[PDB]
Amino acid sequence: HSFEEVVQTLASLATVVQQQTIASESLEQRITSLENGLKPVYDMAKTISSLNRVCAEMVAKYDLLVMTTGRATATAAATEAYWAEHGQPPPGPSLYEES
Amino acid sequence: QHTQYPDARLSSPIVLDQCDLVTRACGLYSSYSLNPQLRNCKLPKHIYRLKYDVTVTKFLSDVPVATLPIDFIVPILLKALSGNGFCPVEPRCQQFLDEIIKYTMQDALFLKYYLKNVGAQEDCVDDHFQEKILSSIQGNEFLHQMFFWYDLAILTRRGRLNRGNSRSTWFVHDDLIDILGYGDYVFWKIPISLLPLNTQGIPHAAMDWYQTSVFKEAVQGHTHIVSVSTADVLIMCKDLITCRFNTTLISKIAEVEDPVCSDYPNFKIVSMLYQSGDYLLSILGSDGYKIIKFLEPLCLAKIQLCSKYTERKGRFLTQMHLAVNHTLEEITEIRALKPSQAHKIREFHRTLIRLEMTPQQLCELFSIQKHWGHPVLHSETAIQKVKKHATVLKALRPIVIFETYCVFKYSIAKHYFDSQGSWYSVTSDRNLTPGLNSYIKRNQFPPLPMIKELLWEFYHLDHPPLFSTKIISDLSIFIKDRATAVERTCWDAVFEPNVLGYNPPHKFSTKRVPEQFLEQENFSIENVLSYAQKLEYLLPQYRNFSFSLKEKELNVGRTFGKLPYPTRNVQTLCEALLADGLAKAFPSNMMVVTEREQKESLLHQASWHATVRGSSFVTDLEKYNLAFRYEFTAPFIEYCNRCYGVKNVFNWMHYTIPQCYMHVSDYYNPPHNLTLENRNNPPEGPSSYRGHMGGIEGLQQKLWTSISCAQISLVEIKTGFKLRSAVMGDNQCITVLSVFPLETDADEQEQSAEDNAARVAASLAKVTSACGIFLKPDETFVHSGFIYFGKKQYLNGVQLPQSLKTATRMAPLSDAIFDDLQGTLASIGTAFERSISETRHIFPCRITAAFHTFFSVRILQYHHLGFNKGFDLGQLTLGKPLDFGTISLALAVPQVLGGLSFLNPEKCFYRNLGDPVTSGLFQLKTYLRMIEMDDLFLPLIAKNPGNCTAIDFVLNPSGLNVPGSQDLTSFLRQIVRRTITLSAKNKLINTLFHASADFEDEMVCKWLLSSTPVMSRFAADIFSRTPSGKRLQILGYLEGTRTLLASKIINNNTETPVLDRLRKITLQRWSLWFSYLDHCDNILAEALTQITCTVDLAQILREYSWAHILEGRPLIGATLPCMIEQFKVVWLKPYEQCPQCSNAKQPGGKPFVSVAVKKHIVSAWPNASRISWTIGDGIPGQPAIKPKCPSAALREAIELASRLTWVTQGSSNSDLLIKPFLEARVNLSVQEILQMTPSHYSGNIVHRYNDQYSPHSFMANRMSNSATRLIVSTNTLGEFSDSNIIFQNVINYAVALFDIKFRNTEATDIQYNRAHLHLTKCCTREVPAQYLTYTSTLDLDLTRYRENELIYDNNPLKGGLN
Amino acid sequence: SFEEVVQTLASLATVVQQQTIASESLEQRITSLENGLKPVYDMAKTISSLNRVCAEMVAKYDLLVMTT
Amino acid sequence: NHSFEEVVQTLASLATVVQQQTIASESLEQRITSLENGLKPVYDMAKTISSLNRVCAEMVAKYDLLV
Amino acid sequence: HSFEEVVQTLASLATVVQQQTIASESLEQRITSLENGLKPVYDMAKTISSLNRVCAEMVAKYDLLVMTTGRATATAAATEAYWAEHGQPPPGPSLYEESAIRGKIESRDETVPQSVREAFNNLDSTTSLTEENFGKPDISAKDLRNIMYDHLPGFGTAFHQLVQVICKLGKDSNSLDIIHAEFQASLAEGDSPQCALIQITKRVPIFQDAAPPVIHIRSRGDIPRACQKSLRPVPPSPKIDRGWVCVFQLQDGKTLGLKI
RNA sequence: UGUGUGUCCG
Ligand SMILES: [Zn+2]
């Protein structure tokens, strides 16, 4: 019964060794994942505030805009609409402001 | 014979460009047109033979070559033209004067008698009534001039015919004045000694044509001078004379009724105003209308100055005074007025300023603006005015546009959520809108005060389409008998070849909508949508957009645009889609009077997050059209496109207008420098331009109104106030609610409300200016209790009268298709009813109507235009001359019996009559009882039945089968159908109008009347939703005589010419009336004896008629009693017992309606003397499933199924009855629509068809001021004697009776406190619950209608279910 | 004696088998943290892209508007 | 004595191994709890950033064909 | 013999259990460090909510701005170059700033296009609007004189001279608005225009204890047909409130006054 | 020879 006991103990210790090795590999990959996850957090935190202030400044600056109408808006819109469907130049003669 | 029919009333702008040609043919000189091309062009074939005319040469033999403009001489002609000369017309209009006066007196008597029969009359009557009326009528200032001008109008109207060769002239010599008429041209020869002079010695009329030395040597030893004009000026002068006569007569008559104080201004001040305006015009030419135009704002300011006058009520008058002073200063510096003339010319506005009248009189005077004429228009000046404001560069603020777009989207979403249940399933990445997600999940909607920081979140919302493009239920909008523009190829073919100087290479086929509609092979709604989607309106041949000067106004000129036919169809489809789709989210509220609103409801509405005071201000909506740019309106247009399935439909105008060449389509002057070589690319000058960036008046009005409402909503959101807006005509009124605490008295409340309104106006001005549209703070006024809007003007809740605007428009002649007498009399009756709707007097309007009725009858009998000269309608139709008695008798029997009577006294109480036949019978009986000829009732009402058809019975459910009560509509419908038979290659109309259409219509109407008992209103209601109704609504499009006598398709069918048939039918109709004793039978006369009950008379009269339709089946739901004959009044004293309720009410008692008078006065302007001047307190079935965006056909099918199911409840054949009516409408099946059909549960269907379905709104025919001081109790009736009593009409009758009884007595003099309306026991019955039973089925094949035009609804379930 | 020894050995074998099955269950359940680790890298890359695109948008704003 | 010592050693080994099964199971449960806790918030963050990037990119794409 | 092998196997198993327990201990330390490093990432919710809000707002605003303008937005350099020659505004819209365009307008050096000048002036002229001065009219001397003339009946009377002197004194004292307001209030309350003028000359503080102006006339011809009854010899110490409206002076030492 | 001289959206 000594040989079978020795074989069983060897198999058990081999299984425990395999479990220890896979646990160590899991620890290593978990550490790598932690490092990768914590690598860019500072950059994200710093960049969020920059985007916040840039967006706030743009929204504030939008309120001080003055626009003047032009004489070639409807023609350009019509040309774009005609090109977007059966795309071709509108039939001649040319429109009011073709530029 | 002829294809011409000149108009009887002014309907065109006054343009005198062509007269420059006429003076060139006679050798004179004139400068009307600003186009030099007319100075050296080729004269037409006519107006060139004038040099061969001996009469014209004799006329122009002792006059200078120089002429004068006609706009400087119109007041002179008006003042110095009376009828004393020789006129070619044989029967002069002055001869048959006395008879007319006689008739008028008779009418007055009748009305009094009628009132005395009702129980209203008056108190302390005067014996001198008829003499006063006689003196007022005979002593009028504008009497003989009216007859003379009508003679002149008859002459010039007859002369305008004979378009062929060898034309003739007419000559009139009236003492000082000489008139020569020739084919739409008039020459006036006048003395020189009666023209105002300059400081240089020349008339003011020659200032701008001649130099000082040229005119003096031109006149030399001459005393008479000649002016040349068209035939429109004569019609205008005739209209002015008629209006002045009517105004003076009404003002004079109104003094007799109320000697102390009357609501009409006067008959002495108005004459002074007329003279002052005439002098101002004669001095200043056509430029005096700039001063005449200030009559209305000055009247408004003077009305506004009749209140507490805290601070701001004097600003508007000051601004108007400054403006009129500046205008008078600017237009008189060049002219060399004498100091006397300079002092005299200001009398008009000096009298206007210093007026002292009550607000009612000023409101009445507000309506005499157009009593001086209309200006002379020029194409050049109008084009220059339009060019400005349409090419200027604007500056916009993007943030305001963003906020407006967000408010637009928010309003649409709120409207969708309010109905339809819940939100519209917002797609597209909901996490982009934090704040709205909670509301969407909880299925709620933000109230309002918290919508200020999540406004931007409405930009990101996306959803499927919410509205349908198959919701057109009226095809008649596509054929309306109008005129359109021509193709770009033949754009210059609408001008005269002689004036142009060349023959255009290309010609058009037709220019009218109905003619082009029938020749379009591929017409369909889907085809129009595809045409719009492919941007087919940008094709080179679809860019014309002509202009047209508008009708009578007081401006330098306003224009409207005309588009080619397919673009016109696109515009009409867009307008219909916007009307039935959007624009219900932006409604017009109205009824914003604070003083006439419930205090609790007003306080509840005024809450945003306690007495409530509201103010208001009004802004003008006129120039918004030209101030719209694509940069501002693009997002709204894109959102409108997205709300439907369309792609490029709603921006048709902004894409093609800038590519068009703009000009005015005037016949006699083309654009400057137009030659054959530069025809494809013409130059732009004084009357043309290329780049148009703004909008056009009328087009896309609904979208612009929606944008304005969105702006107002944004302003309301910005400042924490409550705003209510209304839009009508060319203006919008905005009222602001302020809400105040309790202990704040009532003195500073008005000032605080005015301050709030002023700050709201400032904010709105800032917003609109940031949007590119500029308001005028000078023209914007703020008040606290005065609101004028459309047809309603209120002063602190008190309604002001305005009845002259309708009463002064009465005239013997009007356009009624071939000068039909029935049409003219109906128009006069409608005008009388509308006029008596306002004000409080009664007699003047009825006297005017009675005066004009006999005049129209005589003038049509003797001087009809459809026959040859010297023709007498009343001679051959009878064989004996038409006596006064025959006309008087034939003007008394009502029209429902076929008797040419439209002035029913019952209309003085309520607008809508329950039963025309019963009321007519009662009126005829009363009239015959008044005179001593009571033994004519049976022969008058017996008559003979006509040969009608079930179609006519369905069309008129409450009429009689007599030939004299029929209109001309059937004749025109038959003509149009006959024309369609040999024409209309539309390829989709032909499917609808197949060979067996009439057979199907007759069978459907016969089946609908085969129930037991027979009901007419139900059949008429059902018949309108069948394809027969669609065919009938397509058929009736003819509107005028000109299109009847001049159309190409109508008159190319050969057969009998239309004129002969019209003459035959006119002769037959004239024979039908005025004859008597020839169209009667003794069979019904003996059967209607010893009845003495108007309800029974009406019932047997209805049953005897339609006998060939109703074999022996009973008729129900058609007879109602006359409310005058159903109640009696007692006018109880303050302390007494009613004899009827006490002496004759012992066994069971008598039901009655009680009327009592309140004591609180609230407000009164200017005093509490009159009841009309004061106001008081006191206000006057669910389905299982619901479809999403249902089509028109689905809605019609659902309604028809509901009606059929509800009417037939005692039967068990609904499944077999509704089946044949749904095969031609929808693709669904029976027992599936019934799920959508609401489970109707009512009783006694006649009551639901009488008031619940509301065929008419009933309303009232009196002012609403007196209805707030009376309390009416109707619960005293007990068991309500269900019944034949209409409660709304009972309330209206009581209120109107009380108003009429006390209208000339002061409040303290009234000695009556309460009134009892006791009902008789003869005309009131019991109606039991009855139902219709059908013993057959329609058994007709209606499955052939497989066209998508307006009939079939393939795939109804497209938008989903609720 | 020997029976107790083999019983203890069998019990040890059973508990070692239970240890192996528990360890393999844990290893099976551990292959899910990559679902909760790739979002961090995705957010980093998307924030870099957002910074770039916002800088581009600001540059366009300066180029377009006249400004001062 | 030897058999009793072997029995004691086996019992101690069994106690230690079952204890470390208990510890491993507790660690597994704690890891699952930490995982489920950190699923919804970070996922929401990721989709929000993705949507913002997409809309900004679309705007800039519309802007490029203008200069 | 087997006893030694059994003891050795037991010792080896115990040792292996020892380092596997150590490995599990290290693994749970690694896990604890895992949630320790994962904890400080959950705090970004407050930042990212605001970031999303502001980003969405800016996206909506500028998306609408670019959608309203077409494909001819005319970048600023193009507009500046286009203004130099043929100074009409460029085709297609353009963008400015309030301060920049205001400074450009206020400096007459660079020849700003005219139409832009009127457009900006019209846009900016409406920013100075409050609840006050909204519909307030501008009244000058001539306008008030014409307004007062329009109410007085007749012509050439002494009331015309009273109106003239009142207008002159009000223009000198810069109190025309008070005079006009008092006139309108008195006329509206019921008094006649002559009574209104009387209360004007009696109530305004500036019109208290003032010497009436003296004008010079050559002869009796300057006297109108409606002023002969009012001519009176001058009493000493004239008073404006007493009824003095004007003083007629002649070259030959003659003075006359008028009394209502 | 003067194509119906003209007379739209609501
Ligand atoms: Zn009674």
Coordinates of C-alpha atoms in Angstrom, one line a residue, chain E residues 17-180:
Chain E
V17 CA 0.1 23.6 1.6
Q18 CA 2.2 26.3 3.3
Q19 CA 3.4 27.9 0.1
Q20 CA 0.0 27.6 -1.6
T21 CA -1.6 29.3 1.4
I22 CA 1.1 32.0 1.0
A23 CA 0.2 32.3 -2.7
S24 CA -3.5 32.7 -1.8
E25 CA -2.6 35.3 0.7
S26 CA -0.6 37.2 -1.9
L27 CA -3.5 36.8 -4.4
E28 CA -6.0 38.3 -2.0
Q29 CA -3.5 41.2 -1.3
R30 CA -3.5 41.7 -5.1
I31 CA -7.3 41.7 -5.2
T32 CA -7.5 44.2 -2.3
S33 CA -5.0 46.5 -4.2
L34 CA -7.3 46.0 -7.2
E35 CA -10.4 47.5 -5.5
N36 CA -8.1 50.1 -3.8
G37 CA -7.0 51.3 -7.3
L38 CA -10.5 51.0 -8.7
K39 CA -12.1 53.1 -6.0
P40 CA -10.8 56.6 -7.2
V41 CA -12.4 56.2 -10.6
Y42 CA -16.0 56.4 -9.5
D43 CA -15.8 60.1 -8.5
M44 CA -15.9 61.3 -12.2
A45 CA -19.7 61.3 -12.4
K46 CA -20.0 64.9 -11.2
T47 CA -17.4 66.1 -13.7
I48 CA -18.7 64.0 -16.7
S49 CA -22.3 65.1 -16.1
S50 CA -21.4 68.8 -16.4
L51 CA -19.0 67.9 -19.3
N52 CA -21.9 66.2 -21.2
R53 CA -24.2 69.1 -20.5
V54 CA -21.9 71.8 -21.8
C55 CA -20.7 69.7 -24.7
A56 CA -24.3 69.1 -25.8
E57 CA -25.2 72.7 -25.5
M58 CA -22.2 73.9 -27.6
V59 CA -22.9 71.1 -30.1
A60 CA -26.5 72.3 -30.6
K61 CA -25.6 76.0 -30.8
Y62 CA -22.9 75.6 -33.3
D63 CA -24.7 73.0 -35.4
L64 CA -27.6 75.4 -35.8
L65 CA -25.2 78.2 -36.6
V66 CA -23.5 76.3 -39.3
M67 CA -26.8 75.0 -40.7
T68 CA -28.4 78.5 -41.0
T69 CA -25.5 79.8 -43.1
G70 CA -25.0 78.2 -46.5
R71 CA -21.8 77.1 -48.2
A72 CA -20.6 80.7 -48.8
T73 CA -19.9 81.8 -45.3
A74 CA -17.2 84.2 -46.6
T75 CA -14.3 83.8 -44.1
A76 CA -13.1 87.0 -42.5
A77 CA -10.0 87.4 -44.7
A78 CA -12.2 87.1 -47.8
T79 CA -14.5 89.8 -46.5
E80 CA -11.6 92.1 -45.6
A81 CA -10.1 91.7 -49.0
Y82 CA -13.4 92.1 -50.8
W83 CA -14.1 95.4 -49.0
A84 CA -11.0 97.0 -50.4
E85 CA -12.2 97.2 -54.1
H86 CA -15.8 97.2 -55.2
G87 CA -16.6 97.7 -51.5
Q88 CA -20.1 96.1 -51.7
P89 CA -20.6 93.3 -49.2
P90 CA -19.4 89.9 -50.3
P91 CA -22.0 87.3 -51.6
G92 CA -23.1 84.9 -48.9
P93 CA -23.4 85.7 -45.2
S94 CA -20.5 86.7 -42.8
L95 CA -19.8 86.8 -39.1
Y96 CA -18.5 89.5 -36.9
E97 CA -18.5 90.5 -33.2
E98 CA -20.3 93.4 -31.5
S99 CA -17.2 95.1 -30.2
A100 CA -15.1 94.5 -33.4
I101 CA -17.8 95.8 -35.8
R102 CA -18.6 98.7 -33.4
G103 CA -15.0 99.8 -33.4
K104 CA -14.8 99.4 -37.2
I105 CA -17.9 101.7 -37.6
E106 CA -16.6 104.3 -35.1
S107 CA -13.4 104.8 -37.0
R108 CA -13.5 106.6 -40.3
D109 CA -10.3 105.2 -41.7
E110 CA -10.9 101.9 -43.5
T111 CA -13.9 102.7 -45.6
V112 CA -16.5 100.3 -44.2
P113 CA -19.3 99.5 -46.7
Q114 CA -22.3 101.8 -46.4
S115 CA -25.0 99.2 -46.4
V116 CA -23.3 97.4 -43.5
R117 CA -23.3 100.8 -41.7
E118 CA -27.0 101.3 -42.1
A119 CA -27.7 97.6 -41.2
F120 CA -25.7 97.7 -38.0
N121 CA -27.1 101.1 -37.1
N122 CA -30.7 99.8 -37.5
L123 CA -29.9 96.7 -35.5
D124 CA -28.3 98.7 -32.6
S125 CA -30.7 101.7 -32.5
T126 CA -33.3 99.5 -30.7
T127 CA -31.2 98.5 -27.7
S128 CA -31.9 101.8 -25.8
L129 CA -35.5 100.9 -25.1
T130 CA -37.0 100.8 -21.6
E131 CA -40.5 101.0 -20.2
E132 CA -39.9 104.8 -20.1
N133 CA -39.2 106.7 -23.3
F134 CA -40.8 103.9 -25.4
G135 CA -43.5 106.0 -27.1
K136 CA -42.4 109.4 -25.8
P137 CA -42.6 112.0 -28.6
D138 CA -39.9 114.5 -29.4
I139 CA -41.4 118.0 -29.2
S140 CA -39.6 121.1 -30.6
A141 CA -40.6 124.8 -30.6
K142 CA -42.1 124.8 -34.1
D143 CA -44.1 121.6 -33.6
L144 CA -45.6 122.8 -30.3
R145 CA -46.4 126.2 -31.9
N146 CA -48.3 124.4 -34.7
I147 CA -50.1 122.2 -32.3
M148 CA -51.2 125.2 -30.2
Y149 CA -52.3 127.0 -33.4
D150 CA -54.4 124.1 -34.6
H151 CA -56.7 124.5 -31.5
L152 CA -57.2 128.2 -31.5
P153 CA -60.2 129.4 -33.6
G154 CA -59.7 132.3 -35.9
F155 CA -56.4 133.9 -36.9
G156 CA -54.4 137.0 -36.1
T157 CA -55.7 137.3 -32.6
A158 CA -53.7 138.1 -29.4
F159 CA -53.8 134.4 -28.4
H160 CA -51.4 133.7 -31.3
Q161 CA -48.9 136.2 -29.8
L162 CA -49.4 134.6 -26.4
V163 CA -48.6 131.2 -27.9
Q164 CA -45.5 132.6 -29.6
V165 CA -44.2 134.2 -26.4
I166 CA -45.0 131.1 -24.4
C167 CA -43.1 128.9 -26.9
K168 CA -40.1 131.3 -26.9
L169 CA -39.9 131.4 -23.1
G170 CA -40.2 127.6 -22.9
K171 CA -37.5 127.1 -25.5
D172 CA -35.2 129.5 -23.5
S173 CA -36.0 127.7 -20.2
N174 CA -35.9 124.2 -21.8
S175 CA -39.3 123.3 -20.3
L176 CA -41.5 122.6 -23.3
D177 CA -42.5 119.1 -22.2
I178 CA -44.0 120.3 -18.9
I179 CA -45.9 123.1 -20.7
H180 CA -47.3 120.6 -23.3

